[PDB]
Symmetry: D3
Subunit: 253 residues, 6 copies
């Protein structure tokens, strides 16, 4: 249940407006299928992600709350693993991803939004991890969050379960930019395009690096960087770029 | 030397006003004994921590400075281990802790304050790690600090040893909220209560997670999260919460 | 190609004004030689680092761009290792280092600046990691950056390759202070001196600690801290300091 | 190019006898497709893996050696990532895997064999990582090897590139059992079945744990274990097992 | 339910012979109380640990198997945490511990034995982690095991759940020595005494180090070691030892 | 105080026979100077390291024991750092190193020997870490040892301080080969040459990898490997090797 507008900067819409775009198993799966196609389309250089409706993703899946408390341990684990496969797939995406927080993003969706490379939030949107308020744990989100904000900010958001607003969200480092009420998407598509002008090789790798580093010692990180700094020096894009520079012309990666 | 006002939101006061609440061995021990009782009291859901007097904790223990430079290696290590047992116990506390920085918090106390889950500072209070100014090292604090603020902010605070003020302290991520001159406690007790409304299970675990994650790779962290996300789905609080939701009634965890 | 003004607070100038202080192999080497001498000079307690000219360090080394794309894998690796040896040497420096960003710092220089303990930037200066714009990867910088700013801020800067300005640079945690247009150096020398008043022992160790911690679990970090907190208690500077305190006199470390 | 004999203990054969079962891109892919089906077949509890022919996997893919040295940086990375996806998929497999080293396993195949949960080697088979002898690096293998053998044993095998024999291979911890010349498979199928008698839940998790632990501090590991030890106590298999025990009957997981 | 024979080399006996020394909650607690006293007794330099009866520790706690499958998630976690507190306390013990495996050690006990510094096993004893055979997970043990044996050996033992014998147990690195059928204890007490002749300071620290290292990068580990190597050089025991050496007399630590 | 016989396989002799080759500060320095020259000599492909006299390295530096207990904290740290710089330099050496344990190696020397890539020990030699026996801590060695042997083997050796013999040393993984009483060197030079036949590029990198991996999660390690596996595919040695293979001729790296 997602709509995809292919293009250099592809756009994926969570299609379940009235339900408010719940990250139901079905929805999670549809979102993956897209990312696959989109990852395989050589024309797509970036992917904006947004929601159809008044929100981005925030709507208690009553269909879910009813069952969950009765599923078996083995089924619960099997499911968590699926949902985690989504977050990871997004956070790990090979191409630059940008979340366009048009409306509210609560719990699941809030993490889904955080899992994107960059985030552009509607000046009137809200964001929050409410799991604890009802007995849930924003476990899957925690993974990304410790890397996005300071520890004290993490505790605040996860222990109170409050919803922050665009002004605070940026201040804390949850979102990169705030678009005036109206087109968080337009602005996100803008941001994307810019990032898309840059080298496809350099982008992926930069992302690859930012993944691994946090999980290692200074020296090992430098061992990794050095090696990369090296490899990158034999790539076409570098060749292309350096030429375009010595030809006072735009690079055609 | 601490006073404890039991309650859903318990409050512990560092009782040594005129000396200014020094983290002397004795004081460290009394604080532990409390945390134990309080951790064992099923009525206590949160613990606010503050100081009796003009400060929170900031007062050179001359009794200490005089001895220290003459103790034996084996005694010094034995002591550091005790002080570290305090910081850890606080940072690791099973229940949500909130430091109410009524007055100045310098060196030891500053770390003690930082070791709390959340921090509410008096609009007129000061905070600072002065160890280097005299030859000490805020080693025990460093552990928590790298997780609380950016590296450049860490260096600043630890290399200059300056005292920051409420305005800067929040901006950097050292404190969550600033209470108007007068009741940092009242506001902290407020914050606590809110956090206390949420699920006891979800809270602990959220805390458990935030502890371990920083120390691991993305994938392992996700392995951990998934497993938790799973376990949490068979807990009473979740059952309780989801019910209360389908009964449009307040949850009774 | 660097000038060194010895003193308690030494100052190193990148001498290549018109070329704009490129981090060429030669320049990298000269900078090392200085750090060595300066590390060996018992009179030097801190080192400010700045650039001669309109910039700090930002100037495409055309001599480099021309060759690079033709060097051999083995030569590229050999070189990355040299450049990485510089960053590391700076980030690892035993004495407090302070970068005085007088002018623009782009790519290489931007990292060089980030590798310093503290940073004072000219109210009119710019900073940015442009590697991706042309096909390069700010790999070596990534190592330090993940520790300096939030993940979302890292992505922004490295994926867009934009240049930030003094106002944003501080807000994000890239720089500690902003000097009014004119003397970023003067202010940096100021900052340094202050840090230099503090204990030489306590400083080094504080730095040593901040290096290792990020790369380890809470408990191991505490194991490290405890041990340090211990060792530090048998150092002369501590003896000196505690005396000077009981003699209401300035410490002579 | 692989044959699959479904069953409680499934068996996959590398089908390329005369070429000697090279881990060519095609072969790598076929092997994945199998693991998927097999992972999805509720009747399959274990998977033995062996080779058709005089070897397990050891045959210079001349088709590969000829091209490789001419591919582009971007193509090389793209490929390494594919091969690494295989190793990982095998090492990460949800079900117990057992490599039946019927014949020689050199380089690629040697790692492929090492990536299995357990290994049964033909009393006359050989194993070795020869990458360095020709200019290659057993990089992908290193990942698993540091966990399989002592550092000094790792260096030996990777620096000399020698081929070890069944007697030494077990002694070092490269293989679990040695079957008399003739049926490494039969014995491997045996080993598998045994492991397959045990709890499907307990097995997966035990594997999950052994993955993550090496990459974390003692305490975090215990945090992980505790949580698991907990979760496992609400699984059907445990219920099933404990019953079967109190009914002096065989467990029907 | 444990007996303690104080002495330079203290000995703790698991007292529940006929039940076969099950690691029941009660037993776990009694064992802790001992370790505390013993850790506080300045006369005790080492602690041997063994079992009263035909075994060391191996006896299905039917009282436990009956309940377990019905406890609540929150109770299960609460319990795992208690059992984990035991393993950790043992593995973390400040003084050298030695397990004297007089008889069989299965599951719980097997881990309990592994958690000791050194292990002396009866030439006729058996050891094994059977959790999977019935639906359990040797999670808590995994933590220590990955550090004790090679990965392939870990999988073997945990996936088959088989019981190994003295000959194999040593070969794999599960036990240090094998005593002839009769006095595993006598030999363990012997081993202990020897270790006890050495410096109390040097021992603890050596242990402290072996804990933390596995969980960190080469350089950080060296940062830790260096610091320790340093601290240790100002300890009385070193002073005592070096003297005794220059006085051709036995050291009196 | 070391002698160097340049050659494809260089040999360094610890020259202090009668004193028994103590790792005195002076000796440590001379050894470094050699490694530098030797690392810079394009003719040297491997370095064997051995001792002149009845031993490899084992001789209480009485000159040291006398001072040590009186040096200042700051001096002790300064020294540990120097000694650690040696171990690291050896363990980190860019070229393959091989220790030829002609005679006894105790404490310092034992670690020095362990820090080599491979070890060939005299069938009559002994090895042991005796630090604890006198009050010292084999801290610097611990770093390498946890990677060389199982945890239980580490404890044994470091807690008892005993000296093991060639037969046990290999069994545990402390040494790779045992030469018949007479020429541990000859055999080591042999081993070296063999390793030296292989690709200079592949060797270094293999070493680089084995350094970093232990300190990271499975996935990050694979991220590292993949990248390397990639880079290596554009190196001359690979080109050279693959040619020599298609020319049925010996490779001339």
């Amino acid at each position: 249940m997602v709509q995809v507008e292919k293009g250099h900067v592809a756009v994926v819409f969570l299609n379940d407006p009235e339900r408010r775009n719940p990250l139901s198993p079905e929805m999670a799966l549809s979102l993956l299928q897209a990312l696959d196609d989109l990852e395989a389309d050589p024309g797509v250089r970036a992917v904006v992600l947004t929601g159809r409706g008044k929100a981005f993703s925030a709507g208690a899946d009553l269909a879910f709350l009813e069952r969950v408390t009765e599923l078996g341990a083995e089924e619960n684990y099997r499911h968590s693993l699926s949902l985690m496969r989504l977050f990871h797939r997004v956070y790990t995406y090979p191409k630059p991803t940008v979340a366009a927080v048009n409306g509210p993003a609560v719990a699941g969706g809030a993490g889904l939004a955080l899992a994107c490379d960059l985030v552009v939030m509607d000046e009137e949107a809200r964001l929050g991890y409410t799991e604890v308020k009802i007995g849930f744990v924003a476990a899957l989100v925690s993974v990304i969050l410790v890397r996005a904000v300071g520890e004290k900010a993490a505790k605040d958001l996860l222990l109170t379960g409050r919803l922050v607003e665009a002004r605070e969200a940026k201040a804390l480092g949850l979102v990169n930019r705030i678009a005036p009420p109206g087109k968080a998407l337009e602005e996100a598509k803008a941001l994307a395009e810019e990032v898309a002008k840059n080298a496809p090789t350099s982008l992926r790798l930069t992302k690859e690096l930012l993944l691994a580093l946090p999980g290692m010692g200074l020296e090992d990180g430098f061992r990794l960087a050095a090696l990369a700094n090296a490899w990158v020096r034999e790539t076409g894009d570098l060749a292309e770029g350096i030429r375009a520079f010595f030809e006072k012309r735009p690079p055609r990666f």
